[PDB]
Amino acid sequence: KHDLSSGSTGATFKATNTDQICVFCHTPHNAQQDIPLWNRGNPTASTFTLYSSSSMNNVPVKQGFTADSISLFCMSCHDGATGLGGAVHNDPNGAAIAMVGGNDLITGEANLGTDLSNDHPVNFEVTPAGIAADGNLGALDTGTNPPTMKTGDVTNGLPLFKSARGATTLECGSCHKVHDNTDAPFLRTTMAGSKLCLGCHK
Amino acid sequence: KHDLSSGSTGATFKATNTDQICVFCHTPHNAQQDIPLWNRGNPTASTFTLYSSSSMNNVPVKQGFTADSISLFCMSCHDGATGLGGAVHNDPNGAAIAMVGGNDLITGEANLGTDLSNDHPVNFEVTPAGIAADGNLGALDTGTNPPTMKTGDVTNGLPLFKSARGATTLECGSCHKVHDNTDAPFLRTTMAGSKLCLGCHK
Amino acid sequence: KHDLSSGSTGATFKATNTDQICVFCHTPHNAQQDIPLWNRGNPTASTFTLYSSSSMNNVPVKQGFTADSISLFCMSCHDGATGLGGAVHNDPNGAAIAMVGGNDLITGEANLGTDLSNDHPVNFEVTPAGIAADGNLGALDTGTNPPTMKTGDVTNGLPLFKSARGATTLECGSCHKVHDNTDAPFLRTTMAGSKLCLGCHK
Amino acid sequence: KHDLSSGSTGATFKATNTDQICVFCHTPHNAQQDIPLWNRGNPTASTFTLYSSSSMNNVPVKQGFTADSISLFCMSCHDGATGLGGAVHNDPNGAAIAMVGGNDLITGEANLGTDLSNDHPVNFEVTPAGIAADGNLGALDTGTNPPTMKTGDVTNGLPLFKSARGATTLECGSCHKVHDNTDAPFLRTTMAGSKLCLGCHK
Amino acid sequence: KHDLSSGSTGATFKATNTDQICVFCHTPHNAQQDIPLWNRGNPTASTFTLYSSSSMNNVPVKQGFTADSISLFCMSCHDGATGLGGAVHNDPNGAAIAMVGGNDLITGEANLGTDLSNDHPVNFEVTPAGIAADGNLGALDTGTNPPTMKTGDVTNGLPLFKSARGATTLECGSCHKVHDNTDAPFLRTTMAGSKLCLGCHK
Amino acid sequence: KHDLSSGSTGATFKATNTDQICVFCHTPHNAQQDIPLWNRGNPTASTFTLYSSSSMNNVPVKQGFTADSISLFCMSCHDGATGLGGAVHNDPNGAAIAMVGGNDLITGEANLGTDLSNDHPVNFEVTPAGIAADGNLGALDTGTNPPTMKTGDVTNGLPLFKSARGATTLECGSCHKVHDNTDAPFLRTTMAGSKLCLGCHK
Amino acid sequence: KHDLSSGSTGATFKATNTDQICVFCHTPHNAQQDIPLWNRGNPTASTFTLYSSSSMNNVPVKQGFTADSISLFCMSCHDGATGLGGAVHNDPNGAAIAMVGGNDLITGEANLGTDLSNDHPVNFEVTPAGIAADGNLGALDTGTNPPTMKTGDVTNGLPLFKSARGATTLECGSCHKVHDNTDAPFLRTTMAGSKLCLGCHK
Ligand code: HEC
Ligand code: HEC
Ligand code: HEC
Ligand code: HEC
Ligand code: HEC
Ligand code: HEC
Ligand code: HEC
Ligand code: HEC
Ligand code: HEC
Ligand code: HEC
Ligand code: HEC
Ligand code: HEC
Ligand code: HEC
Ligand code: HEC
């Protein structure tokens, strides 16, 4: 899916003036941030809302992302308003990347918009006190890099990410693995059987 | 019972084109409401009647549910008219969920229909004035989330739910716990001994 | 007395395959009538006769009960012909309730049979004209729910019930309170001293 | 006088194991006859003789009472041979009623025995032909319930009772009112002045 | 005259502790004899003599009355030796009847004493043979109750009474009617004109 | 003649305050003597003389009557000195009997006075020896009551009376019958023809 | 002859308004003298002369009768001047006795007139001295009542009468017996044979 090459066969949206996989994401030189080789323009965090209800631990952090949130990286192409090709910084041929059909914005069901009223919670620090209060959020392992949240049925658990809210924070990349399409839509494991879901919500 | 997986052993009705527990109830993205990850189509409240007699406190609210009533969520599959698989919004494989035998409607004794003339009252605000008038509806605790109605014989009491009629409202989920089948048919405690019944009707 | 649990200590007749107080009387769902949660099979009213003499106001109504008479509910187990356990509708374990000794019918002095030639009158509308004609049937209060017949010596009087013959009708429950055994055999007050009798027959 | 309660102050004979006025006469359930709530054992009529002389209209009926005579009810405790407490049918506490001193039989002047050679005539049908023959037995009124024998000096006359000999029959209750002690020994009017006697024997 | 009530106006002797006409003569219960409701003490017959001369039919019966003679009843208060109030058996208030002035014995001209040497003959059987022998004692009628002695000038004749000497016996009540004072001193007809005397002595 | 009623038509002397025949002679109660019901005051016998001559049998008895002589009864009103109305003992209305004209004494030819020098002999015992001596005084019959003196021409003879002088004594009533006026002046038979005179003086 | 009844057959003079023998001579009451029952008017004795000659003993008594002479009684109707019916005192019917023909005076040979110059001597005392002087006047008997003069040939002699001249006096009745007509004209014995005459004049 994320093979945006012109010669790709399974890509819904692909360029027409380049053949490279990685220019859409990674540039060897002249990148944006010291988070691996990011060459994509990201929006502001002030225009994003998250899931909030009186059953969680994220009440004060229900508005806005952080400046170092990977969820920002994902929504940079998964917001429905940022150009797929027009947001590049280090373009591959000195000009704007040509897009097929002229639709430089993601559409369809994959579009997420700007409101997360219908999405799984992201960018909040899972805490051992919160886990004890709920009593069902598995366990924590700190000896691994990155630290993972222990599960009673899945090997290696789910990776966690460091953010402003804390060093053990759930994120857009917790479930989705961008590069590996072994279990589409790039889930960390094949979802049939609910075994990934049972990893956390036991 | 509510394990609608194809590989389930104790489910009366199960799908044949999926293996996931939660797609029938919860979808990670593109949900219906900001009430936890609801992916089920609910009917209108105008076609529902409730228990009403000259011994209660719910005389003006004996017709119709609210738009935010959990009882609506439960009757969405427990009405006897809404499709068990056809009412999903975010389907798991891009098509309608296949049902065994083709009976996409609940039948048997578990069917409740649309008339509650033979059911325990639901969706009404229990009030301290009403409790004092009756003199037997236990007591109230507001320091817990959700607020519970105190009982003289059962630990932790019964949870209450917030609705349009009020913040302390009895509901379909007051007695039934959807996920925990420790005491089937998903009662909050084992019913033998009438100890749950004695919790309120002392 | 009416604690029909298997673990009960003072019950003459008790079940052996259940432990619940209320299944014998009340079922949460799938009840019989919109009169509180009735799960007991009642007989026909055409086979019942009542007390009749040329000193009362019930001459035309000396034969048969009404379809909404609480006396029917009481005689449903107090007729001497209806099964104590076999008349349930919503059984607690999917089968007929097991009875100790196999005697599913009430016996002894408590048995009332089908003829009320030796019983206090029931199911007739007490009227202010009739009270004035007799001149001793206390007085009437309509501001209370249910309306009561005023007594000159007892606080709160006797409750009355609504029926087909009228809205102020004496009934089996007028003297007997089914749940409260403070004054056995479930009388509304302790009978020693004839103070209950003096409440009406002054 | 007829207040046989243990706490009574003016009763010659009173019980010691009960406090109720009416168990001695009336039981709510399980009575003897369809004549109001009779719970007292009555003797046979074959052992009773009546006043008979060649000046009356009761020559063929001078021996024995009827099975439905109220005089039998009165003599059930006013015969001098039937137990005051031992003749109850529906006892108040599951055992024989305890009597003070052990004298369960009425004694003294109030005792009447079994021979009415010294008593006013009872249980005979007064007839208009007989009244015309004597010419002094007042008049008859049939529009009242029960029918009364008209008197020229007393309001409302004397009530009459229905029996086997006829529908207008003098009886033990014609002069004596069991419940009202306004004019002791329970006469229908105060006897001073002979006005009751002048009501009939003008 | 015989109205012995305390409120009487024409009575020479009256009581002061009662107001009843009939207690002096009749008691409803506990009477003396089976001759109508007699409550007066009578003297012995051995102390009485009668009119005797060689012109009548009563030679062998000139000494003593019978045990069933009404003349005994009359002399019970008309002997001059028996107490007017002290001879009662069933007293009206549990004590001796109080008499005005303390003179409980009849005095004056009305007093008759114990010797009938100056009185009209009583208590002897008038016989048809005796009537034929005298030839002036009217005639006899047996079809009436009581049998009367026919007179040629007076309607209905004189009533006769049954006694030991015979069934057609003259008696104290033959001329005197105790209750009817239409013709004082309680004669059966007004005596002016000798028409009563001419009824027998033609 | 002897009908002294006020309404009488043939009576020379009659009362004005009474209507009774017999009060002048007979009173039912309180009479004077045991000689039938005498209510008239009689004079003394010492003031009476009789017929005496040397041809009879009454020489020693020619002065004075006896205390039991009927002639005394007759002269009680036939002496000319005793009051006709003032000599009553048992008066009919509590007062002296009123007489017409005020003449309470008999006058005229019927007056006899106190001397019998001009009258037929009375009050002497006729004896069989005396009859044999005279040889004309009929015969004697003792089997009749009263004994009569036999006559050869008149049926039933003349009645005789008992007195102190003897049991067969002539008397004022021998010829005169007081009640029967068939042959006035109350003779025992019609005197025309001298047949009564020939009965004795043959 | 002396049967003066109206129905008489042998009487020359008889009444027409009466039928009685004795009213002409004897009245029961109201007579004239104490000489037996005389009811006839007698004349004076001064107008009568008697037989007188110088051969007797009656020289000084030859003029006039005595006031007590029976000869006066006889001449009262045998004088020829006194009325036969008009001289009665006690008349039988309140009026003068009617006489046949109107001749109330005796006539014919039986008339004696007023002069006894032709009659046998009367009313003089026969004396024993006079009898001795004459020597033929029988003898005297004093033991009989009345005293008689003894005769030598006739049984019982002649009765004598008492008068003023003496106790043994001849009289009109000496020979004549007024009542007995055995030997007419009422002689004491049949005169044929002169045996009566020979009784005295021997
Ligand atoms: C972080 C902000 C994100 C973003 C941008 C997306 N996800 Fe998820 N996702 C999860 C599961 C189980 C599915 C399968 C969908 C299904 O079974 O119906 C998905 C799918 C997607 C899609 C495409 C399919 C779709 O239905 O939209 C997209 C574009 C997408 N995701 C974006 C699970 C998780 C999860 C843990 C349960 C987390 C955290 C996220 N997703 C986070 C994100
Ligand atoms: C809210 C609208 C609901 C719905 C949809 C159901 N219930 Fe209840 N329930 C209660 C108890 C004690 C039982 C046991 C039944 C028994 O003992 O016989 C049940 C059972 C059910 C069933 C299945 C079994 C059946 O008999 O129908 C179903 C499908 C069901 N429930 C649906 C008690 C309560 C209660 C408090 C007393 C409340 C509130 C509810 N239930 C509410 C609901
Ligand atoms: C309505 C049809 C009923 C029924 C089914 C029963 N009752 Fe009554 N009850 C009353 C009183 C004073 C007693 C005490 C008995 C006593 O003192 O001896 C009772 C008792 C009973 C019993 C059990 C004991 C018994 O003696 O039978 C039963 C089974 C019973 N009742 C059934 C009084 C009343 C009353 C007002 C006076 C009325 C109405 C009823 N009862 C009605 C009924
Ligand atoms: C029907 C069989 C009965 C019975 C059992 C009794 N009575 Fe009478 N009663 C009447 C009157 C006027 C009195 C007063 C007594 C008085 O004045 O002296 C009574 C009294 C009694 C008593 C108690 C007192 C006593 O003297 O015995 C008793 C126990 C009693 N009664 C029993 C009048 C009548 C009457 C109409 C005149 C009739 C009918 C009855 N009584 C009937 C009965
Ligand atoms: C039966 C033993 C009796 C008794 C006790 C009494 N009588 Fe008579 N009575 C009769 C008449 C005609 C009178 C009127 C009196 C009169 O006219 O003077 C009476 C009166 C009385 C009285 C009171 C008045 C008085 O003079 O004493 C009394 C107390 C009395 N009686 C008592 C007639 C008869 C009669 C038939 C002729 C008979 C029988 C009786 N009486 C009997 C009795
Ligand atoms: C007893 C002492 C008496 C009394 C008081 C009276 N009598 Fe006589 N009597 C007799 C006869 C034949 C008559 C008729 C008179 C006549 O024919 O003229 C009478 C009449 C009377 C009267 C009234 C008429 C009169 O002439 O005086 C009276 C008042 C009277 N009597 C009173 C006959 C007898 C007789 C037998 C011959 C005897 C005895 C008596 N009487 C006795 C008495
Ligand atoms: C006394 C004064 C008298 C009276 C009035 C009468 N007598 Fe005599 N009498 C006597 C005898 C023997 C005869 C028979 C005459 C004869 O035989 O012829 C009579 C008759 C009469 C009559 C009628 C006949 C007549 O011849 O007149 C009358 C009227 C009469 N008497 C009147 C005898 C005596 C005698 C003794 C001898 C005495 C005395 C009397 N009589 C006296 C009287
Ligand atoms: C859009 C998404 C792309 C595309 C089209 C490519 N890459 Fe990647 N890549 C992407 C992200 C968001 C990250 C970092 C994720 C994280 O830090 O959690 C990366 C990272 C890499 C890395 C180093 C990290 C590792 O190896 O685990 C490499 C070597 C890499 N990417 C290679 C790569 C190549 C060869 C591509 C085309 C042939 C290519 N990427 C495309 C996001 C995206
Ligand atoms: C139908 C009912 C289902 C089924 C088949 C599953 N879930 Fe649940 N779930 C359901 C409801 C009505 C609710 C909310 C109830 C309320 O708000 O009172 C939930 C909630 C959850 C949650 C979060 C709430 C909590 O944990 O207390 C989780 C983590 C969850 N559900 C998980 C889950 C999984 C893992 C399932 C398959 C393995 C699954 N659900 C099925 C209703 C239903
Ligand atoms: C047979 C009788 C039973 C038994 C064994 C139980 N209940 Fe009751 N109950 C019964 C009747 C006939 C009625 C209605 C009476 C009327 O309407 O007049 C009820 C009512 C109730 C109620 C609500 C009415 C109220 O509270 O006043 C409750 C809460 C209730 N019953 C509870 C209850 C429980 C907890 C029992 C076992 C622990 C139980 N009942 C048994 C009749 C009968
Ligand atoms: C012995 C007598 C008693 C006693 C101790 C009580 N009652 Fe009565 N009662 C009795 C009789 C013989 C009758 C019927 C008489 C008839 O039918 O002529 C009654 C009747 C009643 C009635 C209904 C008739 C009415 O009201 O007129 C009542 C309501 C009643 N009795 C009440 C009552 C009470 C309350 C008593 C004790 C507090 C009581 N009775 C005692 C005889 C006798
Ligand atoms: C003394 C005498 C009294 C008095 C003061 C009263 N009564 Fe009478 N009564 C009396 C006698 C001797 C008799 C019987 C006479 C007989 O048998 O010949 C009676 C009879 C009655 C009767 C029934 C006989 C009838 O009616 O013919 C009655 C109804 C009656 N008595 C009534 C009565 C009343 C009402 C009195 C006071 C108001 C009363 N009596 C006084 C004697 C005497
Ligand atoms: C004055 C004389 C009178 C009057 C006015 C009445 N009677 Fe008589 N009565 C009288 C006497 C002297 C005697 C007795 C005579 C004797 O013993 O020889 C009587 C007797 C009676 C008798 C009974 C004797 C019988 O019947 O033979 C009766 C019944 C009688 N009397 C009745 C009576 C009546 C009814 C009178 C008025 C209607 C009446 N008498 C008046 C004297 C006198
Ligand atoms: C005229 C003479 C008469 C008549 C018509 C009658 N009697 Fe006589 N009677 C007469 C006299 C003068 C005397 C007395 C004579 C004397 O005393 O000597 C008498 C006497 C009697 C007597 C009594 C004397 C006796 O019996 O001896 C009687 C009983 C008598 N009379 C009866 C009587 C009768 C019955 C008459 C009519 C039937 C009658 N008398 C007529 C004179 C005269």
Short mmCIF file of N, CA, C and O in Angstrom, two decimals, chain F residues 101-147:
data_model
loop_
_atom_site.label_atom_id
_atom_site.label_comp_id
_atom_site.label_asym_id
_atom_site.label_seq_id
_atom_site.Cartn_x
_atom_site.Cartn_y
_atom_site.Cartn_z
N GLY F 101 -137.78 11.43 97.31
CA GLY F 101 -138.63 12.10 98.27
C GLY F 101 -138.08 12.19 99.67
O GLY F 101 -138.64 12.94 100.49
N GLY F 102 -137.02 11.46 100.00
CA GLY F 102 -136.44 11.48 101.32
C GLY F 102 -137.11 10.58 102.34
O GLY F 102 -136.66 10.53 103.49
N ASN F 103 -138.16 9.85 101.95
CA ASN F 103 -138.85 8.94 102.86
C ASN F 103 -138.16 7.59 102.80
O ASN F 103 -138.49 6.73 101.98
N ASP F 104 -137.18 7.40 103.68
CA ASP F 104 -136.42 6.15 103.75
C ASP F 104 -137.11 5.08 104.58
O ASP F 104 -136.47 4.09 104.95
N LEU F 105 -138.40 5.25 104.88
CA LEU F 105 -139.15 4.29 105.67
C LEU F 105 -140.40 3.88 104.91
O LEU F 105 -141.07 4.72 104.29
N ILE F 106 -140.72 2.59 104.96
CA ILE F 106 -141.92 2.09 104.30
C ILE F 106 -143.16 2.60 105.03
O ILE F 106 -143.19 2.68 106.27
N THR F 107 -144.18 2.98 104.27
CA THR F 107 -145.43 3.49 104.80
C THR F 107 -146.59 2.79 104.11
O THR F 107 -146.41 1.86 103.31
N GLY F 108 -147.81 3.23 104.42
CA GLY F 108 -148.99 2.68 103.79
C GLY F 108 -149.45 1.39 104.43
O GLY F 108 -149.07 1.03 105.55
N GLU F 109 -150.31 0.68 103.69
CA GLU F 109 -150.86 -0.58 104.19
C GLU F 109 -149.77 -1.64 104.33
O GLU F 109 -149.83 -2.47 105.24
N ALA F 110 -148.78 -1.62 103.45
CA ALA F 110 -147.71 -2.61 103.50
C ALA F 110 -146.90 -2.53 104.79
O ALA F 110 -146.24 -3.50 105.16
N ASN F 111 -146.93 -1.38 105.47
CA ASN F 111 -146.23 -1.25 106.74
C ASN F 111 -146.82 -2.22 107.77
O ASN F 111 -148.04 -2.34 107.88
N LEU F 112 -145.94 -2.90 108.50
CA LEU F 112 -146.36 -3.87 109.50
C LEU F 112 -146.14 -3.42 110.93
O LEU F 112 -146.75 -3.99 111.84
N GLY F 113 -145.28 -2.42 111.16
CA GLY F 113 -145.04 -1.97 112.51
C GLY F 113 -144.18 -2.96 113.29
O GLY F 113 -143.39 -3.72 112.73
N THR F 114 -144.34 -2.93 114.62
CA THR F 114 -143.59 -3.80 115.51
C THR F 114 -144.46 -4.79 116.27
O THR F 114 -143.91 -5.68 116.93
N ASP F 115 -145.78 -4.67 116.21
CA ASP F 115 -146.69 -5.57 116.90
C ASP F 115 -147.38 -6.48 115.89
O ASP F 115 -147.96 -5.99 114.91
N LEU F 116 -147.33 -7.79 116.14
CA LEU F 116 -147.98 -8.77 115.29
C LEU F 116 -149.30 -9.26 115.87
O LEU F 116 -149.69 -10.41 115.66
N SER F 117 -150.01 -8.39 116.61
CA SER F 117 -151.31 -8.76 117.13
C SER F 117 -152.33 -8.98 116.02
O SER F 117 -153.40 -9.55 116.27
N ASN F 118 -152.02 -8.55 114.80
CA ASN F 118 -152.91 -8.66 113.66
C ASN F 118 -152.21 -9.34 112.49
O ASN F 118 -152.30 -8.90 111.34
N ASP F 119 -151.49 -10.43 112.77
CA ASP F 119 -150.71 -11.11 111.74
C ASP F 119 -150.76 -12.61 111.98
O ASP F 119 -151.03 -13.07 113.09
N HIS F 120 -150.48 -13.37 110.92
CA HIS F 120 -150.46 -14.82 110.98
C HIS F 120 -149.20 -15.28 111.73
O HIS F 120 -148.13 -14.69 111.57
N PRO F 121 -149.32 -16.33 112.54
CA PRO F 121 -148.20 -16.71 113.41
C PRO F 121 -146.94 -17.07 112.64
O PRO F 121 -146.99 -17.62 111.54
N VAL F 122 -145.79 -16.74 113.23
CA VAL F 122 -144.49 -16.97 112.63
C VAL F 122 -143.51 -17.47 113.68
O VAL F 122 -143.72 -17.31 114.89
N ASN F 123 -142.44 -18.09 113.20
CA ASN F 123 -141.29 -18.50 114.01
C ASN F 123 -141.72 -19.36 115.21
O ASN F 123 -141.56 -18.99 116.37
N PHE F 124 -142.27 -20.52 114.88
CA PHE F 124 -142.57 -21.54 115.88
C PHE F 124 -142.46 -22.90 115.22
O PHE F 124 -142.81 -23.07 114.05
N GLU F 125 -141.98 -23.88 115.99
CA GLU F 125 -141.76 -25.22 115.46
C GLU F 125 -143.08 -25.97 115.41
O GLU F 125 -143.68 -26.27 116.45
N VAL F 126 -143.55 -26.27 114.20
CA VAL F 126 -144.69 -27.17 114.04
C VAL F 126 -144.23 -28.59 114.34
O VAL F 126 -143.19 -29.05 113.83
N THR F 127 -144.97 -29.28 115.19
CA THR F 127 -144.54 -30.59 115.65
C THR F 127 -145.57 -31.65 115.30
O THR F 127 -146.77 -31.37 115.27
N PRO F 128 -145.13 -32.88 115.02
CA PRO F 128 -146.10 -33.96 114.75
C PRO F 128 -147.04 -34.20 115.92
O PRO F 128 -148.21 -34.53 115.69
N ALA F 129 -146.56 -34.05 117.16
CA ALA F 129 -147.46 -34.15 118.30
C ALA F 129 -148.51 -33.05 118.28
O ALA F 129 -149.69 -33.30 118.53
N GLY F 130 -148.10 -31.82 117.96
CA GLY F 130 -149.06 -30.74 117.84
C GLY F 130 -150.04 -30.95 116.71
O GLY F 130 -151.23 -30.64 116.84
N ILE F 131 -149.57 -31.48 115.58
CA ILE F 131 -150.45 -31.77 114.46
C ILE F 131 -151.48 -32.83 114.85
O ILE F 131 -152.67 -32.71 114.54
N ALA F 132 -151.03 -33.87 115.55
CA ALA F 132 -151.95 -34.91 116.01
C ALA F 132 -152.96 -34.34 117.00
O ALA F 132 -154.14 -34.71 116.97
N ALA F 133 -152.52 -33.44 117.88
CA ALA F 133 -153.43 -32.82 118.83
C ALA F 133 -154.49 -32.00 118.11
O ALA F 133 -155.68 -32.08 118.43
N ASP F 134 -154.07 -31.18 117.14
CA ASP F 134 -155.04 -30.41 116.36
C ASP F 134 -155.77 -31.29 115.36
O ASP F 134 -156.99 -31.14 115.18
N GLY F 135 -155.06 -32.19 114.70
CA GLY F 135 -155.67 -33.11 113.76
C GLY F 135 -156.00 -32.53 112.40
O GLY F 135 -156.74 -33.17 111.64
N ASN F 136 -155.47 -31.35 112.06
CA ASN F 136 -155.80 -30.74 110.78
C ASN F 136 -154.59 -30.12 110.07
O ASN F 136 -154.76 -29.56 108.99
N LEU F 137 -153.39 -30.22 110.64
CA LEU F 137 -152.22 -29.55 110.06
C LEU F 137 -151.48 -30.49 109.10
O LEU F 137 -150.26 -30.67 109.18
N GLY F 138 -152.24 -31.07 108.18
CA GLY F 138 -151.65 -31.85 107.09
C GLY F 138 -150.77 -32.98 107.58
O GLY F 138 -151.14 -33.76 108.46
N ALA F 139 -149.58 -33.08 106.99
CA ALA F 139 -148.61 -34.10 107.33
C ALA F 139 -147.21 -33.54 107.09
O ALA F 139 -147.05 -32.40 106.63
N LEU F 140 -146.19 -34.34 107.39
CA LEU F 140 -144.81 -33.90 107.33
C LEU F 140 -144.01 -34.77 106.36
O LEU F 140 -144.21 -35.98 106.29
N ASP F 141 -143.12 -34.13 105.61
CA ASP F 141 -142.17 -34.80 104.73
C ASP F 141 -140.77 -34.34 105.09
O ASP F 141 -140.50 -33.13 105.10
N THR F 142 -139.89 -35.29 105.40
CA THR F 142 -138.53 -34.97 105.81
C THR F 142 -137.48 -35.27 104.75
O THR F 142 -136.33 -34.85 104.90
N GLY F 143 -137.85 -35.96 103.67
CA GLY F 143 -136.89 -36.32 102.65
C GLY F 143 -136.51 -35.20 101.70
O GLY F 143 -135.57 -35.37 100.91
N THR F 144 -137.21 -34.08 101.75
CA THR F 144 -136.95 -32.95 100.86
C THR F 144 -136.13 -31.88 101.57
O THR F 144 -136.15 -31.75 102.80
N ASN F 145 -135.40 -31.11 100.78
CA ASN F 145 -134.56 -30.02 101.29
C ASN F 145 -135.01 -28.70 100.69
O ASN F 145 -134.86 -28.49 99.48
N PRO F 146 -135.57 -27.77 101.49
CA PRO F 146 -135.86 -27.94 102.92
C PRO F 146 -137.07 -28.83 103.16
O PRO F 146 -137.88 -29.00 102.25
N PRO F 147 -137.18 -29.40 104.36
CA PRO F 147 -138.36 -30.21 104.68
C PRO F 147 -139.64 -29.41 104.54
O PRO F 147 -139.70 -28.23 104.89
#
